[PDB]
Design a protein around this ligand. Structure first.
Ligand SMILES: Cc1cc(CCCCCOc2c(Cl)cc(C3=NCCO3)cc2Cl)on1
Lengths: 255, 59, 40, 59, 273, 57, 255, 40
């Protein structure tokens, strides 16, 4: 009586149940694991807070309306302030982590709409100015708020044009990245497990984000007659196999 | 204000977002818990230790 | 040592150490396994 | 209820939100239960504050 | 067992009497390390210094008093000593207190003896024979309001009925919440800015309530209750410095202001004998 | 006797915490079905809750 | 060529060397160890940050002068703000820890003076008011500053009379507690290893301090002629075998 | 002979006859031998 459909994920002191899942994706078919010695470089023993950092943090909720263009969060940024995960983050020189991402959106059998939930490794954004204008730090570190693709261009911020993925590629091809759809008629959640993907064994958690999670409405939300025209979307994310190394004074970052 | 079948019902509102459904402390010998069978037996003893199971059935 | 002849006169009984809540907590006719779906 | 010995709080919030189908309206309710896990221990029996009396009962 | 071995002259490079106390150790030096000794045996075991022995005799821990009199028109029985209570604590009397506070944590079963004697300070034809009723109201239990309440029914509360002049006795397991009783506690109930400090917050095991079952005779009778406590099955951890100043309160370490010097001043010099 | 066994992360198709109370059962759910636990022992028998004890004073 | 005298303690990412030690004391002859299952009660898996919390924090320095009466710090309070140790502390419901305490004071072969360094398990302080006046929270939670026994009585604070140990016992008998002397002529540091001592397996780190460390001048400081009349005393302390359990929202404590 | 069922009701315990002052008198980390120099 197991269905692909019902699932439970327990991680730390927190549990999620979905009764309307559509399997789960594990990026590149690899599950998060700690850093092996053969791959290690820094000689420091690392710190593995385990259950105090590897639990589920639910970010603040978004509201899908008929005019929504899509939202974008960066990792580990989105979690920069969650509990002890965040403290560890500002206090060590280097850290490394994988995540379980669970995006939630329920409706009824009269609604229609379909969101794309995708994880993009190394999502370098484009400046809407063109040329070689850079995208300032603050703009690519929105924190739990994430970036709202239907917000206005700002100065020093990225471009927010959806059919170009914020980088000069077409929305249609985002499907080459680990992703899952939430089609109100099928699905009510999306779950993706992200292994740590980098060109170095461990890195800085503040100067470099290693994935952007993106939720994009593709088939517009259509509510039943005289229904309220909107649904909330909630994102809950859990660091998994986290390791921190090179402890010290506590980083100070712009803004 | 007087005991009623209605104090067993936790209401839910359609379309509210982010908000709070109910809250209570966990003094199992007092307050909401006190008239329940658990609450009622706990009161025959001075000390308790252990896990509690709290479930919600949707209607 | 009982000093008296009748059984009523003996002291308190000794702990059941029986304990089986299932007649009260799971009196269902078809057995439910934790983890399997409640209603199939 | 005692402070040193206190056990916490229990709260519940909308994660996304309740959505009713068409042709439907109003409040929906949750029923909530409590029972103890097999974990549980109770000790040192005493008298309950839940029952008292002022004169002996007659037939 | 030898108390001293035989030892003779020494002229060594090995000096057991020179040490460095800064280390925190008390080096086990003996008479035979510095004088010439002869053998002698101990003849003794140290039996009567065992902590079970030290804390194991009955000590008076509480004296209270109740009276038998007509309650007619009394608006507050508790207040007329129509019945009293003792909010179980072993810090009241200081004789047994100092002994216990030689340790930080202590664990033991208690054996209580309760002696009750009657007094008839004003003209009575006789001495009546009263029966006392001691009931332990566990915290969270209906507290006796009157002297013939429904509480005295004590259908779930352990209670004992004995005669005045006589003694009652029983023993209680260790009813501590933790693994042991905290003789001291440098903490609070919760992270408040006004919450009390000490153990008085940790040692909240209800109170004991006494009363006279008998109705009232023509005269009045004073009954004075003395509770004795004996520790049995004692276990004590972490020795501490003995109490030097007088006590002021149950459960706090506080000493009185303008107390007197506790070290006896010499009548003479440092050099004096 | 163990009061709690050790249990770690879970990502299953087997959800012990979803039930149907309409059935009349109280499913025997434990802390270890929904959080990560460590082993602990009971140290207790339930002696003083025996009905002989409860009605026996 | 090993002397009792020279020592190195490496704990985490921090190391201490002393060339003039006087052995080291291990309270009650027991070395800190984690909490065994047989002794466990809370069912929660605990978090053991290891090297990020088990390193050496050096508190701010004190100044021993001829008028000094002595200083008192409480644990874990003194560390309530040190790096990730402190964060963990405010963020979990329960925690447990042992410590290595290293007190430092060097002078020259012409100085004299002798400090007592002692650890008192459960040091319940007395109110200078007498009677049953309590000692307010803030007063027994001085933080890294500790309590200065030569400061003035304050209201709601403890008594600061040295020959009574702040509790009605005589200074002379503090020697029954694990302790070590710093005698300028011998010694220049004191080191004590503290195992976790409590009547419960794990406790709250904020409502209850489980040891007070006390440094008390006993033979007054005497400097050589025309020397400056004072020496600094420094206290460095390292949590060891720390475990935190029952993670959540983050305690808010008075003041 | 115990006449009673519970352990609390038994008489006083019997002498530890344990006795080991070293946790209090010699809690030093490196062992000190009497006769050898205190500080080397
Ligand atoms: C430390 C420390 C230890 C104690 C002793 C606590 C006493 C526990 C309760 O003890 C009693 C019990 Cl279990 C029963 C009765 C009783 N039963 C019938 C009459 O009295 C009296 C007492 Cl004090 O207090 N501080």
């Amino acid at each position: 009586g197991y269905s692909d459909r019902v699932q439970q994920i327990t991680l730390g002191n927190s549990t999620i149940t979905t009764q309307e899942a559509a399997n789960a994706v594990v990026c590149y078919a690899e599950w998060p694991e700690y850093l092996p010695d053969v791959d290690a470089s820094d000689v420091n023993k690392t710190s593995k807070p385990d259950t105090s950092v590897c639990r589920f943090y639910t970010l603040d909720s978004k509201t899908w309306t008929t005019g929504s263009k899509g939202w974008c969060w960066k990792l580990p940024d989105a979690l920069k302030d969650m509990g002890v995960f965040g403290q560890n983050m500002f206090f060590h020189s280097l850290g490394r982590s994988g995540y379980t991402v669970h995006v939630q959106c329920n409706a009824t059998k009269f609604h229609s709409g379909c969101l794309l939930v995708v994880v993009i490794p190394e999502h370098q954004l484009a400046s809407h100015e063109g040329g070689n204008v850079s995208v300032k730090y603050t703009f690519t570190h929105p924190g739990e708020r994430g970036i709202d693709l239907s917000s206005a261009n700002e100065v020093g911020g990225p471009v927010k044009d959806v059919v170009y993925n914020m980088n000069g590629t077409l929305l249609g091809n985002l499907l080459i990245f680990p992703h899952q759809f939430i089609n109100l008629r099928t699905n009510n959640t999306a779950t993706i497990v992200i292994p740590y993907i980098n060109s170095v064994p461990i890195d800085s958690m503040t100067r470099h984000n290693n994935v952007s999670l993106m939720v994009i409405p593709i088939a517009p939300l259509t509510v039943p007659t005289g229904a309220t025209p909107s649904l909330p979307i909630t994102v809950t994310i859990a660091p998994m196999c986290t390791e921190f190394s090179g402890i010290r004074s506590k980083s100070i970052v712009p803004q | 204000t007087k005991d009623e079948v209605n104090s067993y019902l936790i209401p839910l509102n359609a379309n509210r977002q982010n908000e709070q459904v109910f809250g209570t402390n966990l003094f199992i010998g007092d307050g909401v818990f006190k008239t329940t069978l658990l609450g009622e037996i706990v009161q025959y003893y001075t000390h308790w230790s252990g896990s509690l199971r709290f479930s919600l059935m949707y209607t | 040592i009982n000093y008296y002849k009748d059984a009523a006169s003996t002291s308190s009984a000794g702990q059941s150490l029986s304990m089986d809540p299932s007649k009260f907590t799971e009196p269902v006719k078809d057995l439910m396994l934790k983890g399997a779906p409640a209603l199939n | 209820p005692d402070t040193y010995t206190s056990a916490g709080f229990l709260s519940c919030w909308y994660q996304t939100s309740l959505i009713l189908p068409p042709e439907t309206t109003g409040q929906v309710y949750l029923l909530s239960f409590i029972s103890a896990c097999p974990d549980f221990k109770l000790r040192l029996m005493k008298d309950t504050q839940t029952i008292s009396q002022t004169v002996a009962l007659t037939e | 067992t030898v108390a001293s071995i035989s030892s003779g002259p020494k002229h060594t490079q090995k000096v057991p009497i020179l040490t460095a106390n800064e280390t925190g150790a008390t080096m086990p030096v003996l008479p035979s390390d510095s004088i010439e000794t002869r053998t002698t045996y101990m003849h003794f075991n140290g039996s009567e210094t065992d902590v079970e022995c030290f804390l194991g005799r009955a000590a008076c821990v509480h004296v209270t008093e109740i009276q038998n009199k007509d309650a007619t028109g009394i608006d507050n029985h508790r207040e007329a000593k129509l019945f009293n209570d003792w909010k179980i604590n072993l810090s009241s009397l200081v004789q047994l207190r100092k002994k216990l506070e030689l340790f930080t944590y202590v664990r033991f079963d208690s054996e209580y003896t309760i002696l009750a004697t009657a007094s008839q300070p004003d003209s009575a034809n006789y001495s009546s024979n009263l029966v006392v009723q001691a009931m332990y109201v566990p915290p969270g239990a209906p507290n006796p309001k009157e002297w013939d309440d429904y509480t005295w029914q004590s259908a779930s509360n352990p209670s004992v009925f004995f005669k005045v002049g006589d003694t009652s006795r029983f023993s209680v397991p260790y009813v501590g919440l933790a693994s042991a009783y905290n003789c001291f506690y440098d903490g609070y109930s919760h992270d408040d800015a006004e919450t009390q400090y000490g153990i008085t917050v940790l040692n909240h095991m209800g109170s004991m309530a006494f009363r006279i079952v008998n109705e009232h005779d023509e005269h009045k009778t004073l009954v004075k209750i003395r509770v004795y406590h004996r520790a049995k099955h004692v276990e004590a951890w972490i020795p501490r410095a003995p109490r030097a100043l007088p006590y002021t309160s149950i459960g706090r370490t506080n000493y009185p202001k303008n107390t007197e010097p506790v070290i006896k001043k010499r009548k003479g010099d440092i050099k004096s004998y």
